[PDB]
Task: structure prediction
Amino acid sequence: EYVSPRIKAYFNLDLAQIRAFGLGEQVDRLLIALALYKVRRFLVHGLRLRTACDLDCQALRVTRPEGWEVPELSELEAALPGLIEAVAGEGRFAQPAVTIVTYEK
Amino acid sequence: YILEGKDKTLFDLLKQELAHMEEGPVDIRKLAETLLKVDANAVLHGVFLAKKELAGGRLRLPRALSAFIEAEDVRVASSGGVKNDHVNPSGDTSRGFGNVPFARD
RNA sequence: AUUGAAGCAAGCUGUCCCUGAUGGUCGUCAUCUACCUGCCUGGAGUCAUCCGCGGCAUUUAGCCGC
Result:
């Protein structure tokens, strides 16, 4: 078993590459909101990683860009269905969104 | 003694549950309800199957609660110990000596 | 193959003495060199009380330390 006075969780989002996809600013803001959503949900109730790994979050902060502010989870919850609707209306998604395939040898 | 032996009634029922575990989606809830029907403490303290026939022993459940005791600012004291001979009057003879000083804390 | 010897082409001649070493020069020149992406997606996990039954006892005649 290990004892550490400073455990850190690092998160990195590659904005340059998603811009290099160039599918549209609606897709860019969708993917940014989706990533922030994932991070917030993991941070709130994902921290029982292992049976003896009982962890808690003391504080989140941004590192780069300096001085930015992170949305709250309820705000992302409220925004997400609108941004997904917009991207669906732009027709980027295939239809039907969920597609079914059957598996056998 | 349990889930093995010449006679075992509560192998059939578990095999009936593992039939669903194998022939469909694996579900921790079905395991939890089976354990609730056979042993309420198994639900709280967890189980792991190991018989090849029971889906390779893939099914498992971690403990639902845990506890322990710990100390701080401990002052060192000292003690000894004993773990030594276990000899025999006839037949297999291997042990004739032994000791454990340890200088244990 | 045997009683009265194939167990039988059996006795038949090749010896010791000799010194092979003195000296030769394998040696000079030679440019190996330049260009290239390895990388890429993938949970190892889960529950299982260090206590001590040693010594004294050949011992269920019976107890006792760290």
